[PDB]
């Protein structure tokens, strides 16, 4: 008997969706996990001013390796062995 207007999810007069208990428990546990993450992310170690350049050497070496791998692009080698053994298509009982 009760008819819903155009689309029960968008528009003005829409069918309202409510909350039960599973959603509340999920929100509670997610908020607890996020509060635990906030607590564990509330303590540094080097206090910023003690890391002006401790692992920059590894980054520079990795960048040099990536550059050497990207600048070493060349077509593969071409040998005569393939062109010679391709003649074995018409091989008989030899």
């Amino acid at each position: 008997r009760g008819r819903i207007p155009g689309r029960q999810w968008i528009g003005k007069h829409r069918r309202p969706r409510f909350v039960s208990l599973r959603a509340k428990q999920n929100m509670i546990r997610r908020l607890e996990i996020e509060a635990e993450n906030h607590y564990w992310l509330s303590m540094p170690y080097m206090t910023r001013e003690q890391e002006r350049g401790h692992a920059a050497v590894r980054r520079r070496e990795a960048f040099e390796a990536i550059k050497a791998a990207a600048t070493s692009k060349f077509p593969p080698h071409r040998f005569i062995a393939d062109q010679l053994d391709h003649l074995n298509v018409t091989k008989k009982w030899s």
Binding site: K12, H13, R14, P16, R17, F18, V19, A23, K24, M27
Partner: peptide, 25 residues
């Protein structure tokens, strides 16, 4: 699309409704 202030109450979003229902007095 409707404005921010209207007279027909305007039902909020699903996530906003869940947040308001889980954070009650």
């Amino acid at each position: 699309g409707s404005k921010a202030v209207t007279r027909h109450r305007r039902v909020m979003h699903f996530q906003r409704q869940k947040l308001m229902a889980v954070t009650e007095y």
